[PDB]
Symmetry: C2
Amino acid sequence: TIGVIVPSLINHYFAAMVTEIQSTASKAGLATIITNSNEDATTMSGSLEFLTSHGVDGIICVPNEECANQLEDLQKQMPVVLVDRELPGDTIPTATSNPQPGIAAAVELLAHNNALPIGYLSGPMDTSTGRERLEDFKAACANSKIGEQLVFLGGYEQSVGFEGATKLLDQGAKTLFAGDSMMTIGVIEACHKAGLVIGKDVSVIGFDTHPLFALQPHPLTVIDQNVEQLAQRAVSILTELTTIPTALIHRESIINS
Amino acid sequence: TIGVIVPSLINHYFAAMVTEIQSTASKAGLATIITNSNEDATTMSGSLEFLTSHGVDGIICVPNEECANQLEDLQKQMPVVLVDRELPGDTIPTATSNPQPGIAAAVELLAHNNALPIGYLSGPMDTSTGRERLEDFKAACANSKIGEQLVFLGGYEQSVGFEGATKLLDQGAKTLFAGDSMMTIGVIEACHKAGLVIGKDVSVIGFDTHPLFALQPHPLTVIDQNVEQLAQRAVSILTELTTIPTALIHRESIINS
């Protein structure tokens, strides 16, 4: 029996991750209790306290930064592993995806297609995830020599991405490049509401693998993070108690200009 | 602290159900442990056993029919609630949705638009949920005087639905009418692989309220189950220790022929 804590379950990515963490754990003879923090430090605080109180062998977890302290203490006693998100400072084994290879290829591809300017739709800047990927998109643009692009600093709600993406399209974006599952939804909602055919009137780059992204009238080019391998690796590290690269799935949502 | 046990989490409907259950219970002062049974009775049996051994107060559960007996004993001591699915036998308070009003109106609406024949893609026949909805769709067709329509008896994998939906189209279906989220995915895949424009070349009725359904080029008429209300009902019956109408959201995936 192990414990897993995740910020959201309506996020298909985090529900994929726990399905795969659970399946790998059972193959190594271990059960799985899941918790959901709603991106709320107090809630996760509540969970960790509870999980270790009840004799779980290990914890695989997506750290809120506002929990850095309690998370260190449990190490000082509890086998802990962090996944997807990184603690901003000081030892706890972490397995995360490296976003640079996918982001660089998506930018490269936008550049060859003259599908510019790009409206990149950021995620919460309070996550290692949100900043890692915005650094990488910025460097890729320089490295691809297309110059500075449009950036919206999003957050958590589908509403935030819808509002973000609609503003990028106002500012002239010809490509919407989401940096999250949830931002990717806001981009779709935005193209739908504005009357635009993706892969025809505007280009989209999505983030993560949702089954329904592959089945749009023009399937979505997306950045895959390979959830299965991260979950495999993360449970390997929990039993014995690192980065998985990221990839571009080329589909049909980029116009050639 | 309470335990909620759900058969899947990649299922958007059950991820929404557990998010709303957690939310509602913290508004009544209760943390939340979630478990995921992958439609396997060994795992749930294991899980059930776990959450009682560790002194969580209540259990909200989506029951696997081969756990009726074990669930029974928990009552004889644990405040237990079955959601979504029902036990076929004798007791335990259950809050489920009633699928008849939604199913009747989707059928009624297919009948007015002569959008026939209908291929109804059932879910598993060993869930109270799969039978109920197949009975109700059969009666709605008699009640609307359209005759017997085509049925496929589906299951669990997006794959099964995609196979069933493609088979129904070979057999002449002009409307595909899923009985699940997963079946609704398989239905979309089937129209895409086949090259059919939903809303234009074929009609679709979907099941449950994925945000991405409302966005498709022709958004999807779907049967909404009101997960939020089910979840609130189930949590009141837990704190102080029944059916919820189903509804048709009329969008634009039915042709007028």
